[PDB]
Structure 1
């Protein structure tokens, strides 16, 4: 047993209270897939994760779907994408806007919206690379946070 365990138990009833809120807003595990940071983004913007979605997909009060990515700036400078990118994956995202949220560790700093139109420069490079490489799966290429800031439009 570790001395800090006494501290963990003091906070728990508050953690469980947080996890009860996420649950109420469609999220099941706050300790996975950025589960806990999303709920923040969802409550601030007002988007909605729906029952039975694949990945972090969200919808507004009108049907529009969006793709959410989240990054911790104390650690990296490029948003992650997919561990096995290829045309098929790009197609899923192609038509929908993306929402990118930026955290200083666990504290939220900004939320930037990006139009598909702006994300085209990137889908090209990837698809193009794919071919000119032997139809081999790019391993998590990254989107620069700086690019997102200059090209996106800050909504928080």
Structure 2
């Protein structure tokens, strides 16, 4: 049982990583990309916010952030919000966003966009709601290209 052997021996680290993840509010590294999210948290120094919170993270000085991420091996657009409306927008434009770019599970880069750097999309998204008559927008996307063009890279592999 070749591959299997790497299992009872590689498992000490996986567990340690999970221990690390728990100290950071992540109960299961193997669900909802928790293992990738820990990467971002340890690199940036952020603390995750309860899922019920509008934003997803905050630093040691009380500044909050939206946290988006993608695996470029399968997509090129960042998810934003399901049932996206102008109130959601309104809460969004108040905080900086940090974008995590992975290749599979590997963190390749992290970008930070200031509130103004997203002004373009917030405006666009509003039109598609009101000119649209009225009606949510189901998760419009933010192009990795745009993020790279306007953000400041705070991390690279």
| Number of corresponding residues | 155
Q: CA RMSD in A?
A: 2.2
Summarize the Cα distance change of 1:51–1:141 in structure 2 as closer, same or farther, 3 Å threshold. closer
Summarize the Cα distance change of 1:135–1:111 in structure 2 as closer, same or farther, 3 Å threshold. same
Gaps of 5+ in 2: none
TM-score normalised according to structure 1 size:
0.87
**Cα distance between partner residues in 1 of 2:85 and 2:51:** 24
Moved more, 115-124 or 20-29: 20-29
**Cα distance between partner residues in 1 of 2:21 and 2:54:** 16
TM-score normalised according to structure 2 size:
0.87
Q: Deviations over 1:109-149 (max 9, x none)?
A: 11101011010100111111101113122111100000000
| Alignment check: 8 A CA contact 1:34 1:70 kept | no
- The runs of at least 4 aligned residues of structure 1 exceeding 6 Å deviation read 2-6
Summarize the Cα distance change of 1:78–1:151 in structure 2 as closer, same or farther, 3 Å threshold. same
Gaps of 5+ in 1: none
